[PDB]
Design a protein around this ligand. Structure first.
Ligand code: HEC
Length: 104
């Protein structure tokens, strides 16, 4: 989808939990300070539920799709409170934004 639409719409419904713009906080969502290529399951402070901690992926543009589509399914007991996003466009917009949020 669109990178800007991604970041806007992200911020609209995600930033509440995830202030990935600089140096927000964790606090009910880790600030997504470099996902793409970073081995999941190991955050140096707040490292989520064990269900996610145990996941040991590399938050790539596959795992991110499956998660954002169906996060409770992807991880059976994430502390993420999300269940659907819009339709489809957002799963393409968001996952365009974060693909450079990981590098701005
Ligand atoms: C607060 C109620 C949340 C909202 C709204 C969103 N997310 Fe979230 N997210 C939340 C938690 C508590 C966690 C921790 C993981 C766990 O299972 O315990 C997460 C995690 C993520 C991650 C991965 C974290 C990492 O290992 O880096 C991603 C990629 C992520 N969340 C993305 C994301 C997006 C884009 C959101 C809007 C559509 C969003 N989250 C909202 C809590 C919450």
């Amino acid at each position: 989808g669109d990178v800007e639409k991604g970041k806007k719409i992200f911020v609209q419904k995600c930033a509440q939990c995830h202030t990935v713009e600089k140096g927000g906080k964790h606090k009910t969502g880790p600030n997504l300070h470099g996902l793409f290529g970073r081995k999941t399951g190991q955050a140096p402070g707040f490292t989520y539920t064990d269900a996610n901690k145990n996941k040991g992926i590399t938050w790539k543009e596959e795992t991110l799709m499956e998660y954002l589509e169906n996060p409770k399914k992807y991880i059976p007991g994430t502390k993420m409170i999300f269940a659907g996003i819009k339709k489809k466009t957002e799963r393409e917009d968001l996952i365009a934004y974060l693909k450079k949020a990981t590098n701005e």
